[PDB]
Design a protein around this ligand. Structure first.
Ligand SMILES: *[C@H](C)[C@H]1C(Cc2[nH]c(Cc3[nH]c(/C=C4\NC(=O)C(CC)=C4C)c(C)c3CCC(=O)O)c(CCC(=O)O)c2C)=NC(=O)[C@@H]1C
Ligand SMILES: *[C@H](C)[C@H]1C(Cc2[nH]c(Cc3[nH]c(/C=C4\NC(=O)C(CC)=C4C)c(C)c3CCC(=O)O)c(CCC(=O)O)c2C)=NC(=O)[C@@H]1C
Ligand SMILES: *[C@H](C)[C@H]1C(Cc2[nH]c(Cc3[nH]c(/C=C4\NC(=O)C(CC)=C4C)c(C)c3CCC(=O)O)c(CCC(=O)O)c2C)=NC(=O)[C@@H]1C
Ligand SMILES: *[C@H](C)[C@H]1C(Cc2[nH]c(Cc3[nH]c(/C=C4\NC(=O)C(CC)=C4C)c(C)c3CCC(=O)O)c(CCC(=O)O)c2C)=NC(=O)[C@@H]1C
Ligand SMILES: *[C@H](C)[C@H]1C(Cc2[nH]c(Cc3[nH]c(/C=C4\NC(=O)C(CC)=C4C)c(C)c3CCC(=O)O)c(CCC(=O)O)c2C)=NC(=O)[C@@H]1C
Ligand SMILES: *[C@H](C)[C@H]1C(Cc2[nH]c(Cc3[nH]c(/C=C4\NC(=O)C(CC)=C4C)c(C)c3CCC(=O)O)c(CCC(=O)O)c2C)=NC(=O)[C@@H]1C
Lengths: 161, 160, 160, 161, 160, 161
């Protein structure tokens, strides 16, 4: 994976260049936000089970998806689905700390669509649950942190298409 | 950086960052402006640092620029100073990252195998990097030289 | 079912079913009509079994239907009794199958994770299933109650 | 895998239903003749090595297949071939007990044709050996149990075709 | 062959052949004409070697050519001698190769499974190969019989 | 793998034949070359690092390939590349001792092109480096040994195409 710092270094290194004014400005941009990323990560980590619970209650429960025949029916599938939502929240939080989505390509999305397609896991309902996680997270971390987390939630959703 | 390292550690144990990992990130980013200023000094003075380090190395190791030496002659001497300029550039990357990973991944993994194939005496390369540390230290506060010095020392130690 | 479980066990040791496994299957098939009759009694009496089990549970754990409790309010109380009806249904499946596999695969794998996310006290769910066993036992011969009781006991033990 | 019993349970569970009259009639269908499946499985298990030996003697031995240049020449290939026939007999017997061919799709047939084709294992001669196993099995378990076993042997052969 | 065996050993230690491995190959190929003449003499006498070895085996293991025996009757006896002819052929391959791997790959991997399926007592097959060694030895110099004997002994040992 | 000896054995075995005149003459042909193969192998082994160094100096150095943005930039990629050339020389020397290219198919070429293509390793540049290794090797082992080594270097190159 890369973070916002290693991304700038990699871009300079492939050119054989010392960090120029544009590179140093990009690094300053990341350093200026670092404590705000740590604050958002602390809040999410402390509330991670509660964020998933509220998102599930707003987007999936009391529907055909949890009723007999639905993809979230059976305790095994209920548990797999909320485990997946715990993964999306934890990896989106990593990506937000890094200020870079590369961890999502490497550790979340690689073969995920093909796995969902082989098992019959519904992508549309998964994207609705991720959208609920995005909105519940935003309610706790504030609009700025919520929009930044939303970039990474949207990146996961797009990777399922 | 320390950010990637903390995340990779947390990911391997399927957990959120510990309060200790988060505190390391906060400490690192708070020192950010100081690290950028150190990188800027080395970057601005790169011609001086490489040229003067080269002269010091060739005075300690005249064999490498004598007949039969790997750096003998105008063209090979220029390539030798190109390699020192490469290592100064990687040291600036390490300083902004707060750890040695960019130096390791670009210029240390496989370095002994490369220089052995080329016939380059790697103890003399290490000598050139040590010379750059002593010239760079003359441009920095004691505190800044201590921080920058750790990155030069990493390169020198990895070439033994 | 006892058939699939015997096959899976034999396949894991790359062997045919033992004469002991085949004898258990023969015994199962011979009592098959009696297992269907037990399932039909639980099916026919499901309203009484669920309602009376609910009443017993809420007498021992009135906290779960008090303010702050997971089952507080008409709608959450109804959902609670729906879950007991789900577990009674799985117990009828286990009884006809001669093995807990259908119960395990539909209602036990991941059960702790589900109820923990929902905020449901799983010790009180287990108490509701134990209550259904006592009501069901009142509708059956001693022999039939012993057979049905083993499937109730499996659910209670898997939630503890 | 599923058996005749779990197929009925799964069909009731996907609808959220207790077992209705139609489901109970299907379960009675399995119970009515289940002991005949157990009897046939007991006889096959007791005679498994002898069934494969006689089938090989009738369909493969003393031919170009076992001579130099044939696919059963070399002790390694001879052993792999009779191991494959042991697998077909053991899995067909499981499927017959289950009254369901799903174990064959999951544990025998998935990528089997492609494997044989990549190695140059002759499918025609394999189907002839399976036909011999079907006839030798029938001689031991009787014509009616032999026909039921033949359903599962034919399922394996079709999966190779 | 001795060449493949040397290569496989070198490859497993990520290295060129040792000077010792290369010297063994030079010594082997220098003796190559003598090894080919051993193979030619055993080939020219194959009918005699197999027939006389068969007679010795059937005298010491009368069970295999008696009622109930795997080789009982003219046709099964003929098939038994065909198998001894197979193993004599594989022994000539090992002798020219300087290594048992051609024998192992054609006639030993899976041999217990094959003979167990057929109901052939593999200790009697080993006895027939030991008989061929004693007959073959009578047609060779002491040195040549010692070399040929090592290949027969490998087959006998691999069947025990 | 096979060598020139097991090639003759394998050809006799698939026909069920004892070694005939043609088989014994072919084995004699290989035994008569064995010391010349060992001589060439001893010279290559003693000069293995020097052969790769000279090939690299003639085909790869001071080009876009070693500069930032080229595939041999970074010490890690430089070292991986000369390790691959060390492998080609060592395996070609094995194939020459064996008088058979089969070790190349089994231990070098199987999925190699696909691996290079997935990593972005330039195959054209690799084949040019192998061609330089062929010419440097030939200068040390002499024209006959150089031609025989060139069969195996060409075999690796063709397998990469
Ligand atoms: C929840 C909103 C929706 C589901 C989810 C659901 N997923 C699965 C199976 C599943 N999910 C994953 C995902 C990951 N594994 C990882 O290690 C990572 C990397 C961080 C991810 C993203 C995997 C690999 C699998 C398959 C293997 C497994 O079970 O662990 C299931 C189970 C399907 C089944 O087996 O039938 C379900 C139910 N389902 C819904 O209906 C929701 C919309
Ligand atoms: C100077 C202190 C010492 C030398 C140096 C010297 N180097 C070379 C050739 C050379 N060096 C590299 C270096 C790198 N490639 C990388 O990716 C990195 C990481 C950023 C490094 C450090 C390469 C690739 C090469 C080969 C040429 C090319 O650029 O393609 C030479 C030339 C040797 C020759 O051609 O014979 C020299 C002289 N020599 C000494 O003796 C000093 C101690
Ligand atoms: C009653 C003894 C206790 C409860 C129960 C209770 N449950 C729920 C929600 C609920 N329960 C399930 C259950 C299952 N899904 C399955 O696939 C299976 C296996 C067959 C079961 C058992 C689900 C899926 C849900 C979510 C709602 C939905 O159906 O989508 C609630 C409601 C909680 C809420 O919404 O806040 C309750 C009250 N509560 C107690 O306190 C009793 C001990
Ligand atoms: C016998 C009638 C015919 C053969 C058969 C033959 N098969 C193979 C290799 C082989 N077979 C399988 C099959 C399975 N492995 C499994 O785990 C299962 C599921 C239980 C099956 C059905 C596999 C996977 C393989 C390849 C791997 C292996 O060898 O174990 C061979 C060997 C070919 C070779 O390597 O040269 C042979 C000879 N040959 C005939 O001529 C008969 C008609
Ligand atoms: C003689 C010393 C002993 C016997 C031998 C015996 N063998 C067989 C049948 C037989 N054996 C083979 C052997 C091989 N196939 C290979 O690929 C190789 C490697 C080169 C060998 C050694 C085969 C394949 C067969 C099956 C027949 C065929 O050729 O297709 C029999 C006949 C048994 C039967 O048909 O009932 C016998 C008698 N028997 C003894 O008792 C001696 C100890
Ligand atoms: C040098 C002439 C050219 C390169 C080479 C280059 N290769 C690789 C990675 C690499 N190469 C191999 C090859 C083999 N591994 C084996 O075990 C064998 C059989 C003995 C061979 C032939 C592999 C499998 C891999 C990938 C895994 C690994 O790194 O070991 C790289 C590294 C790519 C990277 O990860 O960035 C390079 C640079 N590059 C050029 O530009 C030259 C033309």
């Amino acid at each position: 994976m890369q973070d916002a710092i290693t991304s700038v270094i990699n871009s300079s290194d492939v050119q054989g260049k010392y960090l120029d004014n544009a590179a140093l400005e990009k690094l300053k941009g990341y350093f200026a936000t670092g404590e705000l990323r740590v604050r958002a990560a602390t809040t999410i980590s402390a509330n991670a089970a509660a964020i998933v619970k509220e998102a599930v209650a707003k987007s999936l429960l009391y529907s055909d998806i949890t009723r007999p025949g639905g993809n979230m029916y059976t305790t095994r599938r209920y548990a797999a689905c909320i485990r997946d939502l715990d993964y999306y929240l934890r990896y989106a939080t990593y990506a937000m700390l890094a200020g870079d989505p590369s961890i999502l390509d490497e550790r979340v999305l690689n073969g995920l669509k093909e796995t969902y397609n082989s098992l019959g896991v519904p992508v549309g309902a998964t994207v609705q649950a991720i959208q609920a996680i995005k909105e519940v997270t935003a309610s706790l971390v504030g609009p700025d942190a919520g929009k930044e987390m939303g970039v990474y939630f949207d990146y996961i959703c797009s990777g399922l298409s | 950086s320390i950010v990637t390292k903390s995340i990779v550690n947390a990911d391997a144990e399927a957990r959120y960052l510990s309060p200790g990992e988060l505190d390391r990130i906060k400490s690192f980013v708070s020192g950010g402006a100081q690290r950028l200023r150190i990188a800027q000094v080395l970057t601005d003075n790169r011609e001086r640092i490489v040229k003067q380090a080269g002269d010091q190395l060739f005075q300690k190791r005249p064999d490498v620029v004598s007949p039969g030496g790997n750096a003998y002659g105008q063209e090979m001497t220029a390539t030798c100073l190109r390699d020192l300029d490469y290592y100064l550039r990687l040291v600036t990357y390490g300083i902004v990252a707060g750890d040695v990973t960019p130096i390791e991944e670009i210029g240390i993994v496989g370095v002994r195998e490369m220089y052995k194939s080329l016939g380059t005496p790697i103890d003399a390369v290490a000598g050139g990097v040590a010379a750059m540390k002593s010239v760079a230290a003359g441009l920095l506060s004691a505190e800044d030289a201590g921080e920058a010095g750790a990155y030069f020392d990493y390169v020198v130690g990895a070439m033994q």
